[PDB]
């Protein structure tokens, strides 16, 4: 799935054509198209957890927006297709507007319907059997939590409860006709697990930053690659977790074990669960893994290097200032505002020109 | 909930969804890596008595059509898949997979971890198995059926799938623009080939016809004498199910052909029989070759062909009589792929040059046959 | 199907509710629900030939408009339902908005798909088997003609060529369990005909006015009834043609023979075809039959009383204005104005006030 | 295009579409006027060897469900309808009608002019026919089979659909709210009636239960002696297929019961047998009565009931022995609908008081039976 960055180019035409405009891409692997597609959406780093809705069901105007979005694709078309099904449009109807093969469309439709059931039955209706089937279709714990009105962590504890964890299969070029010694894996909700982690090594996991986008490019991947190379060379068993198909980091040669997975708390925790690494590196893949730090650490993950706390101190506008205050260093005049009339007054204090950071 | 279950002789169970007929099926379980061509595969007579597992997870994506039938029927005794998609989506489709299976009263199961099954077949070698689809599938019962199955080794199935009576075949290959052609007129075909039907795929026949060959498909057991009295421009030995070793009648007849100077060509089973008639030995492989991406080397030319394969047995190279020279070997495992009689106008290939499904890379083996007949015709 | 007249009541709330707003009703009899419905649709005298479209395929807001009309039923709902199927909504989506039983919705969907086929194949694809299929589903020659881009008369000839005409069944209270001697009939595309017309008598046919509406009421029906009573009394075999279930004209006692059918050119010609009447009265049913007069005569129907030409002379303002002139009578000053500024002047000519009549 | 065709003994052909199983069906063709209850009609044993034509055009609107089954199977030989709906639409639906017919292996045709058919049957009387649903239906063949059918006149079909061994029934009627109720415990049923299974609808049984009976269903052929040996509070003669005349066993047994004081109640076939056992005579009607809107008057009360009818034979009023008094007649044609033994507590009704499908109007006949029963018990 391509990764776009229209929001940075406010005045740009944003409909998709023959001249490319995307800035990156994510890739996913799954035992079925449904599983694969869902994994890709949630690894796209656009805040999605699957087919999160774009328009409201009780918008009298929604069908018009949906229509437009289907007819003249933008970067969000994929999401509007599921809004279309939620809104009562048929597969034939969506077909006519988008020209996307029905083979694909019925699958998305099928997923919308399962989501309806989830919303309807709620957490209580999330019995082991339905939960398995959902997971097997690629549903993220976060999307499920959403539809059931709970915290992602509740869906996760529940799987834990029913001992419902994915298994890992390996890429081998040959559909299992020949054995492999390479560890290039992907998660799936199947029977047999091919991970067979070592019990022998001190492991270090490196977290990539998913697709490339403006401000989060190749520079982050180079860092992750170097951590892998360096520690492997020093003797650690290196584990790379990433899903950007364009980089060196997802080249099986780069690390001892590669998990070609969405860099999300859910996917990472399933991995940490079987790998039991000695340390996890979150500071190299850019924003993506950085925003997972607190949650990873809360879950028991052994994060190494600068603590999530320290990172937040720097990143916390207010926290930082104290530190600067504390270190008796110089920072420019600044204040928090809420209101405009507030702003005007403060600005008055601070002085112009001003940096206005939302 | 429509239940189905696959039980292997080793006792491993696979719990899934019935997608075909209700009932049971018993056979040898094999895996085929073809990402396309499921219908052709199903309808291949070579699969008689085998439960086919497809490694590609989505089977049924393009539905089914008559033109993609390699024979009068579905020979597969059962079908094993990971996922049967929601709809068939292809212009050529005339009936969805499930409907078709049901139609053909084939027991089939879906939703099982085909990868797990493939790994086991690969590591542990072929195994017999049983699929039970029905209300409450009896595992124990399935296990017993699988255990009681006699096994394909030592099993003559050619005799079981061959035509009852001789017949003329004058139909050519399909085309996108025209589709399957109307059978030619006997007079539009220069050569006359007698084809032994050991459970022959329509594509082989069609391909010969495309080369000028007018056909007479004769029963597996047809005598050499009865054949010869046909004054054939050449004799073709087809592909087919089971063990080639127990088709005494064919070995003998072949033997006779080899005394003559008529051109002889065999494919797969026919290749094995050729070799037997020549005094070589066959052996059953660990799990066999079933797929469409198998690289075969033409040793003479040192070139590689990606081929289509469907064979559980093989000709031992080490037992090879000197009048048989090695023409092709598998790059996947070095097993024997083709042989040529040093003294006679007789050759054969283990793979399937007619493909359907598969790459068209080995179709030129067909040519070689044509030169031989022509040159025999010169004479 | 009810007859409404919201167009005569501007500021009125035109949504359907628990308080009636309709001014009349039409009824149809068909061997099937689809045949019945369509016949009713063409009998409503609202100018529909069946499921005529309300919004354009290419309208970006059509789904929104469609949605509104479904959700909050107006007099036009039924048309909009078909529009919905052509715009892509599913049976389920429609159901959800309307609460109309899926058993009906599916029939209308099926009719839409058939229409799309006609539009694709065109007149060339209108082979005997298909047309007959179409007729059986109650499609009108006029609806087919619009879809195939030809004149109604062309579909009409086609049917003649193929000898595809309806048969007439009789109403009898008992599903044919007992015989009947009343000639209370309806048209259908079936095998056996029960019309059994007299060869014996001179027949006079009276055309009804269809459903009642504002300005076309019971008064027209009283006259139809009277035509029938007087002529029968006199010795003619009287044939009534109408589909207003509310009236005396549609009481099987009112006439010798009753054809409970839409009063349209198609339906009438089929009756005349088989009845071969001495004359037909088009002057008593109001506007409805009045508008069929010329067409009926063109098709060779023996129209009695004031001629279709005569009717036109009186109905056409221009034609009317000349006769008045011819007669040397007095009519108010008038003028046909095209452009605004063309009126304003002409107006000065005529003198105010003025009766602007589109 | 899944063709089907129906041909009547007279040569008339109706071409339509196959909507059930592939094959042929032969029987007497009858028409039923019921606007609702097709499922119930289909599963009524009385329909054995008969081809059912439904005059109401849309058949299948509400699909099918188990509760709507009148027996363990579909007895109708075949089904003739004008239109099968696109969908079934009812909360109680468990399976669409086409699927259901297929599942029960029924030959059915749709798209024909059922009106023309009904008109012919009414006018010219009942006719035997044949439906062929298949690739290319043989019209000449269909006619031959239609003509070769023996006919229902003089045909004993009761023996053919009767239970093999006697059984006990203690289950009451369905309720919207509780559906079919659990079978009652024998001790909860005061009376014990012995029911002759001549092709009994489940509804008869359920309505008897609802009135306090506990039953013992016995095969058509049960002997009086074995019967009396059970010491029943009453005896019931069910409805059932074919000519009642040939059932000599029933007649004899019956005569046997009439010598005693046990209340006897027959419904339909049961009505005719009683009549026969009393010295009356039965006749085959021109077309009979099949519908659910049939008026029958209680002459002793001068009142009308709308009832369910499904019979092709009737009892001749004119030959009524003196001990049989006329209790009901058809308002549509004056035929005999009820009788009561002047000297014994034995009576019967030609129509179906249990309905299913149909008006509940005649339910009360059942109450007279209980009345009789209790009275016999007072003794
Ligand atoms: Cl731009
Ligand atoms: Cl569930
Ligand atoms: Cl499995
Ligand atoms: Cl057509
Ligand atoms: Cl017909
Ligand atoms: K499974
Ligand atoms: K027909």
UniProtKB/Swiss-Prot annotation, chains A, C:
Name of the protein in its database record: Carbamoyl phosphate synthase large chain
Species of origin: Escherichia coli (strain K12)
GO terms under cellular component: carbamoyl-phosphate synthase complex; cytoplasm; cytosol
Role: Large subunit of the glutamine-dependent carbamoyl phosphate synthetase (CPSase). CPSase catalyzes the formation of carbamoyl phosphate from the ammonia moiety of glutamine, carbonate, and phosphate donated by ATP, constituting the first step of 2 biosynthetic pathways, one leading to arginine and/or urea and the other to pyrimidine nucleotides.
Domains (record comment): The large subunit is composed of 2 ATP-grasp domains that are involved in binding the 2 ATP molecules needed for carbamoyl phosphate synthesis. The N-terminal ATP-grasp domain (referred to as the carboxyphosphate synthetic component) catalyzes the ATP-dependent phosphorylation of hydrogencarbonate to carboxyphosphate and the subsequent nucleophilic attack by ammonia to form a carbamate intermediate.
Family: Belongs to the CarB family.
Keywords, alphabetical: Amino-acid biosynthesis, Arginine biosynthesis, ATP-binding, Ligase, Magnesium, Manganese, Metal-binding, Nucleotide-binding, Pyrimidine biosynthesis, Repeat
Parts of the chain that traverse the membrane: none
Region called Oligomerization domain, residue ranges: 46-195
Known partners and oligomeric status: Composed of two chains; the small (or glutamine) chain promotes the hydrolysis of glutamine to ammonia, which is used by the large (or ammonia) chain to synthesize carbamoyl phosphate. Tetramer of heterodimers (alpha,beta)4.
Any one Gene Ontology molecular-function term assigned to this protein's record: amino acid binding
GO BP: 'de novo' UMP biosynthetic process; amino acid biosynthetic process; glutamine metabolic process; L-arginine biosynthetic process; pyrimidine nucleobase biosynthetic process
Entry annotated with the keyword Magnesium: yes
Portion of the full sequence shown: 359 to 716 of 1073
Gene this chain is encoded by: carB
Binding site residues for ATP 2: 357
UniProtKB/Swiss-Prot annotation, chains B, D:
GO biological process, one term: L-arginine biosynthetic process
Domain Glutamine amidotransferase type-1 span(s) in chain numbering: 192-379
Keyword Kinase: no
Reaction(s) catalysed (UniProt annotation): hydrogencarbonate + L-glutamine + 2 ATP + H2O = carbamoyl phosphate + L-glutamate + 2 ADP + phosphate + 2 H(+)
Positions bound to L-glutamine: 46, 240, 242, 269, 272, 310, 312-313
EC number per UniProt: 6.3.5.5
Pfam families noted in UniProt: CPSase_sm_chain (PF00988), GATase (PF00117)
Positions of the catalytic residues: 268 (nucleophile), 352, 354
InterPro entries: Anth_synth/Amidotransfase, CarbamoylP_synth_ssu, CarbamoylP_synth_ssu_N, CarbP_synth_ssu_N_sf, Class_I_gatase-like, CPSase_GATase1, GATASE
Top EC category: ligase
Region (CPSase): 1-188
Source taxon at top rank: Bacteria
Associated pathway: Amino-acid biosynthesis; L-arginine biosynthesis; carbamoyl phosphate from bicarbonate: step 1/1; Pyrimidine metabolism; UMP biosynthesis via de novo pathway; (S)-dihydroorotate from bicarbonate: step 1/3
Quaternary structure and interacting proteins, as annotated: Composed of two chains; the small (or glutamine) chain promotes the hydrolysis of glutamine to ammonia, which is used by the large (or ammonia) chain to synthesize carbamoyl phosphate. Tetramer of heterodimers (alpha,beta)4.
Family statement drawn from the similarity comment of this UniProt entry: Belongs to the CarA family.
Described function: Small subunit of the glutamine-dependent carbamoyl phosphate synthetase (CPSase). CPSase catalyzes the formation of carbamoyl phosphate from the ammonia moiety of glutamine, carbonate, and phosphate donated by ATP, constituting the first step of 2 biosynthetic pathways, one leading to arginine and/or urea and the other to pyrimidine nucleotides. The small subunit (glutamine amidotransferase) binds and cleaves glutamine to supply the large subunit with the substrate ammonia.
Stated name of the protein: Carbamoyl phosphate synthase small chain
């Amino acid at each position: 799935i391509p990764r776009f960055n229209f929001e940075k180019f406010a005045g740009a035409n944003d409909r998709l054509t023959t001249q490319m405009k995307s800035v990156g891409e994510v890739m996913a692997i799954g035992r079925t198209q449904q599983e694969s597609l869902q994994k890709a959406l949630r690894g796209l780093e656009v805040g999605a957890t699957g087919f999160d809705p774009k328009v409201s069901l009780d918008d009298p105007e929604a069908l018009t927006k949906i229509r437009r979005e289907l007819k003249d694709a933008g970067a969000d078309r994929i999401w509007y297709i599921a809004d279309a099904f939620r809104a009562g449009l048929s597969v034939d109807g969506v077909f006519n507007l988008t020209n996307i093969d029905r083979w694909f469309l019925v699958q998305i439709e099928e997923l919308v319907r399962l989501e309806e059931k989830v919303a309807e039955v709620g957490i209580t209706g999330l019995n082991a059997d339905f939960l398995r089937q959902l997971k097997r279709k690629g549903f993220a714990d976060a999307r499920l939590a959403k539809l059931a009105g709970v915290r992602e962590a509740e869906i996760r504890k529940l799987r834990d409860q029913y001992d419902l964890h994915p298994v890992y299969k390996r890429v081998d070029t040959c559909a299992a006709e020949f054995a492999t010694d390479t560890a290039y894996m992907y998660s799936t909700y199947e029977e047999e697990c091919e991970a067979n982690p070592s019990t022998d090594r001190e492991k270090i996991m490196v977290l990539g930053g998913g697709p490339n986008r403006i401000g989060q490019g190749i520079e982050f991947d180079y860092c992750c690659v170097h951590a892998s190379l360096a520690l492997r060379e020093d003797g650690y068993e290196t584990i790379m977790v990433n899903c950007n198909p364009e980089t060196v980091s997802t080249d099986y040669d780069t690390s001892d074990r590669l998990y070609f997975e969405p860099v999300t708390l859910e996917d990472v925790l399933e991995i940490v669960r079987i790998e039991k690494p000695k340390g996890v590196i979150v500071q190299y893949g850019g924003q993506t893994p950085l925003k997972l730090a607190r949650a990873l650490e809360a879950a028991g993950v052994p994060v190494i290097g600068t603590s999530p706390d320290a990172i937040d101190r720097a990143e916390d506008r207010e926290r930082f200032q104290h530190a600067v205050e504390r270190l008796k260093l110089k920072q420019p005049a600044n204040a928090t505002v809420t209101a405009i009339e507030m702003a005007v007054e403060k600005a008055k204090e601070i002085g112009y020109p001003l940096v206005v950071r939302a | 909930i429509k239940s189905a279950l696959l039980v292997l002789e080793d006792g491993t169970q696979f719990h899934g969804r019935a997608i075909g007929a209700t009932g049971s099926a018993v056979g040898e379980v094999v895996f085929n890596t073809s990402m396309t061509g499921y219908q052709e595969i199903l309808t291949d007579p070579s699969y008689s008595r085998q439960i086919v597992t497809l490694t590609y997870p989505h089977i049924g994506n393009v539905g089914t059509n008559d033109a993609d039938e390699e024979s009068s029927q579905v020979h597969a005794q059962g079908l094993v898949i990971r996922d049967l998609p929601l709809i068939a989506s292809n212009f050529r489709n005339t009936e969805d997979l499930s409907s078709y299976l049901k139609r053909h009263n084939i027991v089939a199961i879906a939703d099982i971890d085909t990868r797990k099954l493939t790994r086991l077949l690969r590591e542990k070698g072929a195994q017999n198995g049983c699929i039970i689809a029905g209300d409450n599938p009896d595992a124990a019962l399935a296990l017993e059926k699988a255990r009681a199955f006699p096994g394909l080794n030592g099993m003559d199935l050619a005799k079981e799938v061959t035509t009852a009576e001789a017949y003329s075949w004058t139909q050519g290959s399909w085309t996108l623009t025209g589709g399957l052609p109307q059978a030619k007129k006997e007079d539009e075909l220069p050569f006359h080939v007698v084809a032994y039907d050991f459970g022959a795929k329509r594509n082989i026949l069609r391909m010969l016809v495309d080369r000028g060959c007018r056909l007479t498909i004769v029963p597996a057991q047809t005598s050499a004498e009865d054949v010869l009295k046909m004054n054939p421009d050449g004799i073709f030995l087809s592909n087919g199910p089971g063990d080639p070793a127990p088709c005494d009648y064919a070995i003998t007849a072949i033997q006779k052909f080899l005394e003559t100077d008529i051109p002889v060509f065999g494919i797969c089973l026919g290749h094995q029989l050729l070799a037997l008639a020549s005094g070589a030995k066959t052996v059953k492989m660990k799990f066999g070759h079933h797929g469409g991406n198998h690289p075969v080397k033409d040793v003479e030319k040192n070139v590689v062909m990606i081929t289509a394969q469907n064979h559980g047995f093989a000709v031992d190279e080490a037992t090879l009589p000197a009048n048989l020279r090695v023409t092709h070997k598998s790059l996947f495992d070095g097993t024997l792929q083709g042989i040529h009689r040093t003294d006679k106008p007789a050759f054969s290939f283990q793979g399937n040059p007619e493909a359907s499904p598969g790459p068209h890379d080995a179709a030129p083996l067909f040519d070689h046959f044509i030169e031989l007949i022509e040159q025999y015709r010169k004479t």
